[PDB]
Amino acid sequence: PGVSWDSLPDELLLGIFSCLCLPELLKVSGVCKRWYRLASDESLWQTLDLTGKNLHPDVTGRLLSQGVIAFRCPRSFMDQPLAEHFSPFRVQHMDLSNSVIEVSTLHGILSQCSKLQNLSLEGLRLSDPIVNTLAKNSNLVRLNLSGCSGFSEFALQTLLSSCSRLDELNLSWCFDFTEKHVQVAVAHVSETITQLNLSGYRKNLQKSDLSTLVRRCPNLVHLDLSDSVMLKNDCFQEFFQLNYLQHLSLSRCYDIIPETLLELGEIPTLKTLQVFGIVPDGTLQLLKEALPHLQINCSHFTTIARPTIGNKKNQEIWGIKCRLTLQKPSCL
Amino acid sequence: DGSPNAGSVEQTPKK
Amino acid sequence: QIYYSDKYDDEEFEYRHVMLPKDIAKLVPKTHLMSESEWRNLGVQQSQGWVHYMIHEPEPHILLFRRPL
Amino acid sequence: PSIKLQSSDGEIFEVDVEIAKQSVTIKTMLEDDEGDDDPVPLPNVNAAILKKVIQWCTHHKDDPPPPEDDENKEKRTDDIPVWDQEFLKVDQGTLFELILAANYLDIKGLLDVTCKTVANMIKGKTPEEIRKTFNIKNDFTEEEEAQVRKENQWC
């Protein structure tokens, strides 16, 4: 050809590269040095979706170092030691729920993220240093920690004392939690939060902890307290003190007399009251019919600080769809 | 009565 | 008509899988793994310590649980 | 009559001024007849005949993330459903001049359609000859490309 196609303005090469898909974008990196340097551009890499993929730690480290603002990666298997340190990343939204990552590479990766805004570490084992380094963010609007473990009360105190802009916190079902952990959690959670999910602690939850939680934090909208065996019929005064509560979803609180639940119907702001496993048959219909503004026992699962919620096979984490993604098999 | 299974219902039915 | 399978074992872990009826198998989430506060809402009645860890794509109506040993 | 400012690239070509209201450079120079020097006759007459269509291509939607995303690119494999000048089956060189002229005038429609056409044509090709067709002499040595091949061994 008589036309110098290499003599192309970068604004056009980037434009044509924008239409290329992820599995093909690595192929054009080898055409020439000019195309190699422009292949790893910060404009192309802005939404990474490596869901359910086996990645070496160096690969994901380099990809993040290329500049990523959203890194979806549920159920991955990066389980090898880290080798080379990397410049600080810019990951604003992250998702590592139900992964296999070991603590060493988890510390190697999370030690560089200092501009985070959302996080989700559901089911992942942690340690003392990894919770301490999460205090560097201080901008975490949402934090998911359901199923986590491995940290002591001091790390939790540091984490909830440094991050003062939390909006949601799904701190639920951490099995190695004593009364000290729950006490520190209710004491040091910032007053700016609007939703909490301190569920599944049983004897470790006491009426005093609920009292200080409702006194310190006058902003709650969702207060799922599931499997709280020690929440008796006298604890409804604390919920009455709440003025912005909308979805209080108790569960299996066996010390709650079902009839007294009609008292909870006095709260004008209440919308839905999920109550499971304590109200028996016959009385459930009477309670539903005698409370004709509350959608009693309607929603089963929790939408609390969860990245992907729904039933339409959504692929967006907190309202952010991933543009550049590894295509799932759909050919015939 | 009172608590035939409630409170200790957290176990497999074993039927 | 929920049927519970026999527990099997492995290194420091104990596994059990539960099959679901078609009435409540359509309510199972597909984009996340539930917690004990959520699958006890489905009607499952195991003991304490069972955490859902994987979802079988060919048979979504089978729930998998593992407990440390 | 109506304003009919003409282009200028060494010759005179009549274009309706208000009809050609989509061109950024033309619209800017309108407020200042003797512009658009760089574009070659063939690309600018092609731009003129395309710009004869104004209402048929509707307007621009307001949805930044999906519209520019590759997900809608899979929905944009039609390029423009209505004819793309025989689907832009023109030669590589004249397509290059057309895309350069569209970059000069900064028109969104051409910079979208031509770029998507180039992406489609360079999409499925193995790299061995994708530089032969575009005439680039690769600078990589036998070790330089080895590193690149090692890096992209996880797709």
Author numbering:
A (entry chain B): 2093 to 2424
B (entry chain D): 4176 to 4190
C (entry chain C): 3005 to 3073
D (entry chain A): 1002 to 1033, 1038 to 1160
Paper text:
p27KIP1 (cyclin-dependent kinase inhibitor 1B, p27) is a member of the CIP/KIP family of CDK (cyclin dependent kinase) regulators that inhibit cell cycle CDKs. p27 phosphorylation by CDK1/2, signals its recruitment to the SCFSKP2 (S-phase kinase associated protein 1 (SKP1)-cullin-SKP2) E3 ubiquitin ligase complex for proteasomal degradation. In contrast, low p27 levels are commonly identified in cancer and associated with poor prognosis. p27 is degraded via the ubiquitin proteasome system, where phosphorylation at Thr187 by CDK1/2 signals its recruitment to the S-phase kinase associated protein 1 (SKP1)-cullin-SKP2 E3 ubiquitin ligase complex SCFSKP2. Notably, p27 bound to a CDK-cyclin module is the SCFSKP2 substrate and unusually the binding site for phosphorylated p27 is contributed by both SKP2 and the accessory protein, CKS126,35–38. Using cryo-EM, we provide an in-depth structural analysis of the quaternary architecture of the CDK2-cyclin A-CKS1-SKP1-SKP2-p27 complex which forms part of the SCFSKP2 E3 ligase that controls p27 ubiquitin-mediated degradation.
Local refinement of SKP1-SKP2-CKS1 provided opportunities for further modelling in SKP2 and C-terminus of p27. The most drastic improvement was observed in SKP1, in which the resolution was enhanced from 5–6 Å to 3.5–5.5 Å, allowing previously unmodelled residues in loop 2 (residues 64–71) and loop 1 (residues 31–41) to be observed. Owing to the enhanced resolution of the SKP2-CKS1 junction, density for the bound p27 C-term peptide was also improved to a resolution ~ 3.0–3.5 Å. This permitted backbone modelling of additional residues (Gly177, Ser178, Pro179 and Asn180) that extend back towards the LRR of SKP2 with p27 Gly182 protruding over SKP2. CKS1 also binds the C-terminal phospho-peptide of p27. Unfortunately, the flexible nature of p27 prevented modelling of the full sequence, however, C-terminal residues 181–190 including the phosphorylated Thr187 residue were solved to 3.5–4.0 Å. This C-terminal peptide lies over the SKP2-CKS1 junction, where the phosphorylated Thr187 sidechain protrudes into a small, positively charged pocket formed by CKS1 Tyr8, Lys11, Arg20, Ser51, Trp54 and Arg71. Analysis of the CKS1 surface hydrophobicity profile also identifies a role for p27 Pro188, which stacks on top of CKS1 Tyr8 and is wedged by CKS1 Gln5 and Gln49 to provide a linkage to CKS1 whilst constraining p27 conformation through its intrinsic peptide angles. At the SKP2-CKS1 interface, a cluster of CKS1 residues form a hydrophobic pocket in which SKP2 Phe393 and His392 bind to stabilize the C-terminal loop.
